[PDB]
């Protein structure tokens, strides 16, 4: 945002199971108009896996046959890098509904790689927060800018993390253990609100 | 049937020319395939395109 | 193809067939020694042969720390003695555009043009076409510095399995990213891209000018390249293409 | 040596001469392709041979993520079927001391001095891959996430410290690993070089039959064990 | 007299034994040396140590 720091977005572009196995092409397509590959990842999505992806769409709109369709087969997650990465996305994307894009933007990949609606060719980020959302769930631990310096990381923490922390400190004073991060650590992994609880045999 | 492929292999290389030994023996295991799969009297190496 | 490594390259294997005899590849390792003894050159790759009517003409190329000048390429008959050629230039260069054909065996042969023609200026002539038209360096193998020096790339990886296939992703050895890519080709389309062995090979073989040969494998430092063909330019190519 | 040195036909060049076929080329090509597809190993050499009386031994290993971890070694002797060769104990490395004599063939041969054929190779291939196995220096980079990789920016030995003999590790548990110079006993190396200053011969002699090849100028390097399978305490005679 | 050695090289890479291709040419030279030096009925490889 400011003078002596940049703003570089990301986006996330999702390969197909139908188009996967042409995917040298469309990456040649991807990597020579401007956009960076920053981390490929090859990922079967669970039907399990796809709803808690997609809650923003399919938690309100009822669409089960797109849920089985990226069960068929492999998925190619990408992270994007570019100036004005969403509008040149969505430039060369393309609208939706593959059947009408194939006579309205004829140059675009949906209208090339794509059959219909829920047999599309490739799934793009909207918004920003979207963006953040899609890359967050799919992706391992990176950093996605802004970094929320000040009171927003503060009251992430306080209430998100530091209640059970409150709790887990109140209990790991009486008593004393000796090297308490092996107290902590458990009391974490056991009095876990997020996670339940866990007895093995 | 086939006649002897690994002497005449030996014999191209002389001339700097062929596949060198793998290549030309995988050619000829393919030839060992071929002659296996057919009844083919005669099954020589006609060579490169 | 380098010399400390002529037998660590697939020659044969690399599919256009035409190779050497043992007896030429311990002549070259010897001397291509030599060579690099008495020529002070900072690496010295095999160019390649030229099969020719009566006897063959070894090609070799040897290259300074600058990495980017014109080559002091050398010739032998028997592929043992070798010795320089002159420096070849525009005006030299055309000066055969009234003859064709295969050239053969000593330089002392005289071409009818009547100006007589020698068959030594000719080879140099014709060898620094290969060198510009064909015979491409691969990405990455050469980094930019601020100044003119050009340092080969001891950090080569350098190209990934997705860029194998593509054209941009070499780029020709000629001064001029760094040096002119390979789309901007004519005709379209006169280069052989062809997967041998897998993923464990590549050739780029040229149709301007065969029977070129580019030699990868990819994770590697070779990084190679061979010209045996017969000699003279493919006239002949957007026919056949 | 993996696939690329078999590729280049290397073991007759570094002048052992026990060596390998075309058709074992050939097959330990197609053959560790497919050992590589199988079982998901990071890499796949072809360890050496074995020298049998009835049939001949091939032995390849495969090796994890860590460069340091505990090979799955593999043996076949028509050199495409390749099967997995248990883990050696220390139980199984006292057991076969006590049988002396070659290695026949034919996996089910059983010694009378019962002592499994199949034990006495697995027993054998850790001996050697404990004592005799070779690493040059800079090979390696023990990574600080406690796993062991490949260096890939790994610039070729100079031929200053080729003859020291200080610049050789062991590719087993410990520049972080032990060197060559205090092998026991001193001396039980064959320093060679081959034409010009194009490879580094290495030749084991507590174990004969192991070579190891390193050209000094790039990242070529591995060893081959192609022998008797014995392991010649008669080295302190010798010298 | 120099005795095929170069074919029966390429016999002893069929085996798999051998310097190699280019070590046993080499070998054949030092020969042809040897036989050109000295007064030589039969020099062939007895090998190498």
Redesign the interface.
């Known amino acids: 945002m400011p003078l002596p720091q940049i703003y570089v977005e990301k986006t996330l572009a999702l390969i197909k199971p139908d188009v996967v196995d042409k995917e040298e092409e469309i990456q040649d397509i991807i990597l020579g108009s401007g956009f960076t590959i920053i981390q490929r990842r090859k990922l079967h999505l669970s039907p399990e896996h796809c709803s808690n992806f997609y809650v923003e769409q399919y938690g309100k709109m009822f669409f089960p046959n797109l849920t089985a369709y990226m069960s068929s087969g492999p998925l190619v997650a990408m992270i994007l890098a570019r100036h004005k990465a969403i509008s040149y996305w969505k430039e060369l994307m393309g609208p939706s509904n593959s059947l009408v894009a194939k006579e309205t933007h004829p140059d675009s990949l949906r209208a090339i790689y794509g059959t219909d609606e829920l047999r599309n060719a490739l799934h793009g980020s909207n918004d920003f927060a979207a963006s953040e959302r899609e890359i967050r769930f799919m992706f391992p631990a990176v950093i996605i800018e802004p970094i929320p310096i000040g009171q927003a990381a503060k009251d992430y923490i306080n209430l998100y993390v530091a209640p059970t922390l409150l709790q887990g400190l109140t209990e790991l004073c009486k008593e004393k253990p000796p090297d308490p991060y092996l107290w902590l650590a458990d009391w974490l992994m056991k009095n876990n609100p997020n996670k339940p609880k866990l007895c093995h045999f | 049937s086939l006649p002897n492929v690994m002497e005449s292999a030996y014999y191209f290389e002389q001339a700097g020319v062929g596949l060198g030994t793998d290549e030309t023996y995988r050619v000829f295991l393919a030839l060992k395939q071929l002659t296996d799969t057919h009844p083919i009297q005669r099954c020589r190496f006609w060579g490169k395109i | 193809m380098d010399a ?2 002529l ?2 390259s ?4 690399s ?1 256009s ?10 002549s070259l ?1 010897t001397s291509l ?1 030599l060579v690099k003894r008495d020529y002070r050159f900072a690496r010295v790759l095999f160019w390649g ?1 030229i099969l020719g009517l009566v006897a063959d003409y070894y090609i070799a190329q040897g290259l300074s720390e600058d990495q980017l000048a014109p080559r002091k390429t050398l010739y032998s008959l028997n592929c043992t003695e070798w010795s320089l050629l002159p420096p070849a230039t525009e005006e030299m260069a055309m000066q055969i555009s009234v003859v064709s054909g295969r050239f053969m065996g000593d330089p002392s042969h005289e071409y009818e043009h009547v100006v007589q023609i020698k068959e030594e200026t000719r080879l140099v002539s014709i060898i620094d076409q290969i060198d510009k038209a064909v015979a491409i360096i691969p990405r990455g193998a050469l980094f930019k510095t601020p100044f003119g020096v050009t340092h080969v790339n ?2 080569f ?1 350098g190209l990934p399995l ?1 860029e194998v ?2 054209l ?1 992703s070499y780029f020709h050895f000629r001064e001029a990213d760094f040096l002119d890519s390979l789309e901007y080709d004519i005709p379209r389309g006169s280069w052989s891209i062809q997967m ?3 993923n ?1 090979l590549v050739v780029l073989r040229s149709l301007l000018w065969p029977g070129l040969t580019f030699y990868h ?1 990819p994770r ?2 070779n990084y190679g390249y061979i010209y ?1 063909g017969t000699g003279e330019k493919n006239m002949d190519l957007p026919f056949m293409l």
């Open positions: 400390d490594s037998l660590l697939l020659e044969l294997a599919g067939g035409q190779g050497l005899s043992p007896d030429r590849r311990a390792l020694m042969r001891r950090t990886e997705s296939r593509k941009s041998e062995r897998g464990a494998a590697t430092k045996v």
